[PDB]
Amino acid sequence: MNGTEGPNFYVPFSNKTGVVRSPFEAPQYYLAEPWQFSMLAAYMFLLIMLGFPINFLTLYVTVQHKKLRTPLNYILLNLAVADLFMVFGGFTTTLYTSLHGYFVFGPTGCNLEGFFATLGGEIALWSLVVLAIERYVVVCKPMSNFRFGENHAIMGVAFTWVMALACAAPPLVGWSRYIPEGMQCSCGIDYYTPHEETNNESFVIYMFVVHFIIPLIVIFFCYGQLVFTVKEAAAQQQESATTQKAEKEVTRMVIIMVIAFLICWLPYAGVAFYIFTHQGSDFGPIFMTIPAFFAKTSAVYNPVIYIMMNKQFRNCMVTTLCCGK
Amino acid sequence: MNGTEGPNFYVPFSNKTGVVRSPFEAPQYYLAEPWQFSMLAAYMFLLIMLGFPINFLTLYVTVQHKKLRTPLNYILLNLAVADLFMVFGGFTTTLYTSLHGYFVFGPTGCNLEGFFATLGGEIALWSLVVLAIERYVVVCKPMSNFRFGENHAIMGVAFTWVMALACAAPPLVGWSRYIPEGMQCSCGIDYYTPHEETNNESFVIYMFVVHFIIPLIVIFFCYGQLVFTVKEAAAQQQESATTQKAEKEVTRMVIIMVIAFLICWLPYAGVAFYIFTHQGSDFGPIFMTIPAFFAKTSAVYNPVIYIMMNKQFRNCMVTTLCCGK
């Protein structure tokens, strides 16, 4: 056959060889050599360290600074909160799996793995819509006295949260499940089999048609309505105003932001298409594993772009660095 | 017997078991389980990342800043140079060894490993003497118009360099050798055997009695002559002068610096004593391996203490961070 099947695992290699044994108990050096295995482990601790201290620093900075209550501060504060939950309940069990080659917890650890991965991805993707609509408002001006505060901004964060605890949880109860992908070292969603028992096919369609292309195209047509008035050909300040210069700053920032997110997240499910619709001829392990694990660096590069161009936020950073001036 | 012997390796485990085979070709999961092995690999990439970018940043900072030509800038610039050479020609082959369990290069890679380890340690240890004598001069005042510049400071860096290329090189030619220690994953100097063929015993004595205790006690008696006039019980500025306040700043900094170096480097050869003089009863693997690899974090925490208290150097850092102001 064109792979290998199990009740909680799918090795992407033919069991006609007669070597596939218990993967959640045994290591899996016979699917792939241990050199790229240890490479992936090191590449995970990479993001663990590069996340933790900058995250805690940005948390304490925005905790101390009662000067910036523009809602983007709130957005990248609660994104940082979700990323704290991610780095605690996320990469540590993946690194233990890459340490031993399997969840010693068994499917319990695999269920713990995806409990924050797709959740964090969902927050990081849908949160950029809430600011996109804001930028469109400040550019097109349907109102005159409108601005976002304690009764226009936190509602969008609650939107992202209530979809986060409605898009990440449903596989936990049996409408979907978790199955190891990649080198069978990362638990996600199946594309290898229909598996009508847990109702995955309708679940996979319900996930893709709701969460992937629709907010994507709302973002693209917000960008399809953000090339006329304010110009990407930047020369210097004072196009219209100084707060509008800050608008232009955040505009170019979010353009490069969503472009980086595109470059990251395109092949992640671009290969899942080929695995889902077209199964039966054959497929490759490097064909799928590499582009999916390209995208595990997503939230870690969200604070640094906020350091890149935001001027006075960087002033807050460099002031409260030594906690002096 | 009380261990296991070879022509280029010494497994710290009895070969009466009848399992010791080629270590430089085979992995060594049968000496110790692979969990702490992968732990050590991750703990190496830890220091690799935590070294590289801060090192390049400090290099370019001191390259741009023609404002601070006080010699401590030169000292921690050329220490950073030696650390660039270290992180290039050092931890990468150790991480490859921890990736595969052995030098694929064979003894060539093991010889490449120690070519910068003891060299970097020698520079980091002896360089702190050159500033210690300086602080003692500024505290005791034998002269009146004396200060360190382009003809008093670089001579000390040349001292450290000419001992660096006289203390690290001699094992390369046959007066000593390199042999894997720890989990047999780190090449250093033997304490398990006399091995009179390559003349190690006289070499080990010549190393310890010259490089370890003598500069150590010169440092301690410089500290034995640095508790009377300027006081560690600090209250605020203006004890004598503002440049003398900078002297007090660097004084407390170097006190904590050498104390941290003491805490790091004490057991590293404190266990080598027990292995060298007392061999024949038995010894433990955790007895030696843990305290030696505690000390592999030495140079990486040298820039951050320079960030800790140095005020205007930190001003140079935060100014040239964005390359503006």
Swiss-Prot record, chains A, B:
Provenance organism: Bos taurus (Bovine)
Membrane-crossing segments per the record: 37-61, 74-96, 111-133, 153-173, 203-224, 253-274, 287-308
Xref: Pfam families: 7tm_1, Rhodopsin_N
Post-translational modification: Phosphorylated on some or all of the serine and threonine residues present in the C-terminal region.
Name the UniProt record assigns to this protein: Rhodopsin
Topology in the lipid bilayer: Multi-pass membrane protein
Stated role: Photoreceptor required for image-forming vision at low light intensity. Required for photoreceptor cell viability after birth. Light-induced isomerization of 11-cis to all-trans retinal triggers a conformational change that activates signaling via G-proteins. Subsequent receptor phosphorylation mediates displacement of the bound G-protein alpha subunit by the arrestin SAG and terminates signaling.
Glycan-carrying positions: 2, 15
Originating gene: RHO
